[PDB]
Symmetry: D3
Subunit: 298 residues, 6 copies
Amino acid sequence: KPISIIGVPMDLGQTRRGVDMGPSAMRYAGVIERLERLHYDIEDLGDIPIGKAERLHEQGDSRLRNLKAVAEANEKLAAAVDQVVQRGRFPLVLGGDHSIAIGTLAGVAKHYERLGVIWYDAHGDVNTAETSPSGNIHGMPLAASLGFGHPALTQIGGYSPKIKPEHVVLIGVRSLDEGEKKFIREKGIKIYTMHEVDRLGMTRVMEETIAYLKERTDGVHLSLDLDGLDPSDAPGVGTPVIGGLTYRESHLAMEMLAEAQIITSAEFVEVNPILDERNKTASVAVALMGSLFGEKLM
Amino acid sequence: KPISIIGVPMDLGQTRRGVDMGPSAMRYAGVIERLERLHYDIEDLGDIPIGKAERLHEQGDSRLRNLKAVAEANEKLAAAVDQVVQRGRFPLVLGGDHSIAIGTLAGVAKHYERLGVIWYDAHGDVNTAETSPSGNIHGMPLAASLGFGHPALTQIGGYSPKIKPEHVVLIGVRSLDEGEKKFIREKGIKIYTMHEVDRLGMTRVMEETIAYLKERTDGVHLSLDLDGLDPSDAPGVGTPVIGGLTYRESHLAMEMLAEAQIITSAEFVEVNPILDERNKTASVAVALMGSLFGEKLM
Amino acid sequence: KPISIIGVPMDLGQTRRGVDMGPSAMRYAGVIERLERLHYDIEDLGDIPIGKAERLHEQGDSRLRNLKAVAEANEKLAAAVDQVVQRGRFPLVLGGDHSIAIGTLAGVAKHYERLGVIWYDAHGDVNTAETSPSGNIHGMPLAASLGFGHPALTQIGGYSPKIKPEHVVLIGVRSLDEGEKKFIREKGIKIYTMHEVDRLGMTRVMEETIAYLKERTDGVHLSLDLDGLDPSDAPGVGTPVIGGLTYRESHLAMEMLAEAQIITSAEFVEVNPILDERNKTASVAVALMGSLFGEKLM
Amino acid sequence: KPISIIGVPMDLGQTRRGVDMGPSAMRYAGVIERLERLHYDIEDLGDIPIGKAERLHEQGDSRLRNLKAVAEANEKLAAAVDQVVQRGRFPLVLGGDHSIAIGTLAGVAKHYERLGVIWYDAHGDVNTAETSPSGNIHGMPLAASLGFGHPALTQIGGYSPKIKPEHVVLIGVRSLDEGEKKFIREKGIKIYTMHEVDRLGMTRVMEETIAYLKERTDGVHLSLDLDGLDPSDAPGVGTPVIGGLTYRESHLAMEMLAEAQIITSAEFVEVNPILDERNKTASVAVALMGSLFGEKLM
Amino acid sequence: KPISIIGVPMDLGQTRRGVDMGPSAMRYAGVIERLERLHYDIEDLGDIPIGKAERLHEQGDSRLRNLKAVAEANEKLAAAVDQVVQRGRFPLVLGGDHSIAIGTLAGVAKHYERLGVIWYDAHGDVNTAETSPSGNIHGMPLAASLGFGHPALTQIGGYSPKIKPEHVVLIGVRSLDEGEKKFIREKGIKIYTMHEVDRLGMTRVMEETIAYLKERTDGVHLSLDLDGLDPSDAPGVGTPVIGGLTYRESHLAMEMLAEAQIITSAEFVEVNPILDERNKTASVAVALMGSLFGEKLM
Amino acid sequence: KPISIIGVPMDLGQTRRGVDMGPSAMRYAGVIERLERLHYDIEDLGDIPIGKAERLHEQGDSRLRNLKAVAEANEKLAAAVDQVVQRGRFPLVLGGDHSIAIGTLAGVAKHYERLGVIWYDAHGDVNTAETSPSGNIHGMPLAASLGFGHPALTQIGGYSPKIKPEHVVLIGVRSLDEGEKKFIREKGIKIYTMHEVDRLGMTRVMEETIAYLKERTDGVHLSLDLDGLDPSDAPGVGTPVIGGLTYRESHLAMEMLAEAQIITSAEFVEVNPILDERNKTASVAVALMGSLFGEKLM
Ligand SMILES: NCCC[C@H](N)C(=O)O
Ligand SMILES: NCCC[C@H](N)C(=O)O
Ligand SMILES: NCCC[C@H](N)C(=O)O
Ligand SMILES: NCCC[C@H](N)C(=O)O
Ligand SMILES: NCCC[C@H](N)C(=O)O
Ligand SMILES: NCCC[C@H](N)C(=O)O
Ligand SMILES: [Mn+2]
Ligand SMILES: [Mn+2]
Ligand SMILES: [Mn+2]
Ligand SMILES: [Mn+2]
Ligand SMILES: [Mn+2]
Ligand SMILES: [Mn+2]
Ligand SMILES: [Mn+2]
Ligand SMILES: [Mn+2]
Ligand SMILES: [Mn+2]
Ligand SMILES: [Mn+2]
Ligand SMILES: [Mn+2]
Ligand SMILES: [Mn+2]
């Protein structure tokens, strides 16, 4: 299936500037060339125009920083993504902080009876204005897409929820706020924290993950946050957490998903060139994209 | 169970100065805060006064450097640890080179019918004045505790031995002197060198270890030497050995022990701030302690 | 005098992508805050729209890569810069590769009887299509501004030349092509290579430079290329050259210029976040700007 | 069985100079001392005289660079190795780029009814003048040994092929040329790329490998290319490829081979002191040799 | 003149923990051995007992954090230093944060008609409760010793001021608060910020400094703050500032003072092992002490 | 004047192995290409055959380790160098540890009425068997050349002394043994330790040096030891000493010597690839040679 790249230069979902440079950092890391080599009909639809956020002061919720700019950008993203899917193409969204997942899922989900989600991340991203300790919207996209949160975020695309909790699998988690641990526990979301990764091994985690979703979804969206990898492998992220997944574990995961042929959409987020070591993180993202799309060693 | 921290600023067990700053480096790394967050009644009993060693030439044995000072300090430690156990608390000892294990086990063992020991280390620490290639007492605490060595070390606390060989499990070993290899073989001590860890995996090593000790002990003392971790993960150690356990393997181990609920006392040794990279090692120790005491990602 | 910031996201002057992110990396490095603190009326006019280069094979000259896009973007820059000068403000241009100097000088020069130029760089940037060993226009802005080269570059702004050779001072040079060595020698351009900086000292080089230009110009434009600093100090540059000026030498230079009150316009170029170590270079640029604009330690 | 060391200061198999210093770097890394400690009768037969290759433009060799010099050096190596085997000694060849495998296998294979080969590498080394993308002979030794390629290479030692495809096992492969992927596919060579290593684990890979060859060979030659390890573990290699085998995985592999007692000859190649970090790579090689030859932690 | 070392394990003058380990970090870096080699009668009087500070809450001034504990420790220090001077020995105080300068000068000054001070630092340390932006007493010792500040600090030793502004020379300054710039300007304190160091050179700065003080003092106290050096040379400091003095500039300074024979007392402060890279900073301090005390290359 | 390169793969002058690889490391660092570009008639005479030194316990040489092998290799070097000078060529010797200076000066000095020597080093190399603290002959070449030491070393070439003390200038010295300090003092050798370099500046030191020797010699031999540069600039050296000359100071020195046209012979020693960071040190050497031979920035 032909691919369509959409860049979302977003940084309003959090506070470290530079994550808005992720789309071009990955383009510069050679994402087009990489995918063209795999004989893909790759197309670059450019970037979603993001508006500058109103200053905190006259702005409404500190528990929902930059809500309007974030909500509007995601509206545009949802539309762009919706059209790509309608055109029969695979939407590959490049971020940008994780709050863009709200728009990506808003444009994809409407097209599936039961869309599953693989949330590759160090965080759960299931906070609300009530549970969020930062007010950073990049820490709320999964909950908002599950129908939990401010209507400005939950109603993107004119419908909700975008997905069901039983159709979500979290991988590489190692930093959850108390409210989030409770949310995960109660909504019954499937999750493999680093303990399970260390205990079971990435192979078993991926096998179980793929089998689980394949048995109850009709499309799977890969929401890959680069901070899911160890800061040593992916240094250029705004909210890094030590003791993460390795470069190899990430490739195996992508390779196993490629093989499974279950990934119907994807987004690579949180790449921040301004916090990286010579574009290393964008590079990792591009390599991981290659594996996801079927690149093989043999 | 409430915890009691006892710092043992000891460096007389070896030759690299600075390991005596380990207790405070770990305190500065945030051990109290870490444990309080887990809802523990934590208490800091301060440090064991360590005397200074007498003139080397007017000392008794070259194969037992600083024997007088090491033996006396361990006497004090044993008493302090004994008291804590009597009070119904968990003794958490912060070192300090590994020679302090002699005092810790001396105050703990007397309280158990069959105390088991998990020795997480790159070394076996089963040398005697005869087999020791250095004369460094930090390389003799396990043998001494098993009743093998100079009476000045074997009789700490007025009894011996503190433990039985069949109740000991060595993990992470990758540097044994010939005499020690023979000792381990002959005393029949259970051991998982890096080969076994590489071959079986930390999960299997921990499963087997926990099952073994649980089936024949009434209390388990964790003697964790930071040099058990690779120098890249734990640079601040006096006698580093490459090709060690990773940060993740160490957390999984602690996590599986917490789960097992078998650890009745513990000590984290060999942290040397003066050989470290910005208190990295003291930090690792504190994090591993959090896991040991039940900290979880989810 | 109020300042006006103009970003020129240009990378068509050379081949390393990412230098187009220099303007925003410097903004993120805090250029506005830095200057506001010095009590300046600072204004950000945004960025100059840069078009994309046409197919290489259907381009006109290999010795003048991306001539069309580079020349047109420089036209826009010249206009913007011209306007700022007319408004009574100081034009502070943020790049972007060094080819943007062509546009900056084009909008500034017309306003001075004898505009002088201080070219802080590891290179001379005095190549033509004939002498250029790369075809990279970022290696031709000084010659072009002096009236030497392709008319598409020499006629920007509708006039030429922008400056006279006798009003130019090169500082920090350590990498000149043969053609350029000849050019400098023959046009009689004042130059202080690293040898002179090492032999005389930055203080003497700056004293001599300031005295020279002050005695025969009515305005001085500072064209500061970050690669003028050693790659250890400024790692984020496309064409680094070892054995460059230090961080301290650069601050002293800016500090002595501020003192002299001779700089009437400036530009900081070649900052490439994608080749940097955590925005270090953009940071250096911002600090040097603070000094240029009068920031003092006491 | 007594060991005989033969250094092959070869770099004509590729383009990065310095790999000819590999033999002395490893000797200086202490190969003799290491092996003597395991009570071996170790002997150093010095180095094979390598003749400088004539100008590429003068002698016909571009898809086969330095063919004459590489073919003759390998002739000498073949003889030296043949003689060592005849004397009842184990031939331990120290390289030198991988093209020397052609000579080593040429001197060993004639002595076995069915010699197996474990090719520990990031590459397949199964290119021919037709499929080679570089013309570097170090990328053709395995194919040439299997009887595929220029006669100057396939006929070394007066016979061919030296081995059969079904008796070859590739391990750690992560960089194969298209022609090579096809070669491996069609010749039916058993291969464990990094995907299999990540998926199955080194233990499994080694178990399967040892059992496979043990069931159908009468001798097994270990051709270990240091670039099979990750560049972070083995930095001093000419053609590094990221996402490689770890230090520990390599020790386990060597340890399990020692155990199986199947390795009848070996060569450690691609060590280049001039691209390394303080002889780190030669050191890893020496250590790995210690394990291969039975060195144990316990 | 014989030397007497007094360690002041102080960290209450600021907020980064670990600076209290500076005395032993320097002892471990070999300060005694170093000075003994220069044939000195060196004596170690141990450490000043420092009391733990009352918690901020019930504590008085936030503008004067830990005032009572800091004031009391300095009382003890002043007494210890006073006696050393009385015994005809040179007081060498090892810190500990800079707030200890209050006690050192309190014990020395009473013994001189006109005691001069060389304040080697990145900061001015001339803040008061009114001008301090942090409330950190380590940022007030020079002003307090000049008679400016809270009486609890200005009256240490029962007299004030300890020195006159005209007898003070600041060197390496590059980070002054506004109040401090004003204080320096108005009290007329002689100061060489990094601008003067870069402009004049360390040699001229030291020549001018030595001549100035020698012409109007009867004793000179060297208050050396390790953060006066660049964080690359002295990484282990709590409040580092980039663009500092080099290792060589520091040795030249010490060498030139040794030669001048004007230093009658000294203290090396701010060494923090917990923020350093393998005791590098304590090491630099010990080497600098060697030069100060006459160690020479020839 | 045409240049003749002679490699001397010597490491018997000290204990760190690998320095025998210095000649090829520099050749690989591009010494020929570098010099040819300056339009020189460069010729490579290969390497001097060095014989392995017999066991320390078997042949009498401990205050003079490897004396036989070092004395004879230097005999051969002396002849080779003598012949090059006779042919009217400039002898450029590539080492190899510093003991090779004995042979170089032995072949050059006989051709000059008053040969001067610039000894660029961190050491003085003026030890004798009596004063040597190591027994390493690389610490005795200058004394031996001045006619002080074992006859096996002082009589190389059939004559002595090769030079007079008043015609020697040491530069960059920062590590002298007591006997050496006395030797320099008494023989009245002109010396610029790092104190003088820091105090006067490299320009001044070089000006004074050139003028001194130019006024009283008829030829000047440059004996450049790479360890004269700081270990950060030249890491690959066996006996590094911190606080050394910078890369720039070395280039200025070489540049000023080229200018003076006084250097009639030279040798670059102590390059050890096995202790370096990717041939960095050989590279600095090559670069420094380029300058010495007239390479210029402009
Ligand atoms: N996307 C990262 C979220 C980080 C954190 N858990 C928060 O809610 O602020
Ligand atoms: N604590 C490390 C012990 C090191 C060695 N086995 C010895 O006994 O010296
Ligand atoms: N801006 C760097 C210029 C590099 C070189 N002189 C060239 O013209 O290619
Ligand atoms: N031994 C490395 C070979 C790399 C590549 N397949 C080539 O043939 O050039
Ligand atoms: N001793 C450092 C003082 C730091 C700062 N100027 C302050 O007053 O907080
Ligand atoms: N060339 C280095 C010599 C170092 C020391 N002076 C010695 O003679 O051992
Ligand atoms: Mn996320
Ligand atoms: Mn995340
Ligand atoms: Mn231990
Ligand atoms: Mn240990
Ligand atoms: Mn430029
Ligand atoms: Mn440049
Ligand atoms: Mn290979
Ligand atoms: Mn390979
Ligand atoms: Mn201070
Ligand atoms: Mn300071
Ligand atoms: Mn030397
Ligand atoms: Mn030297």
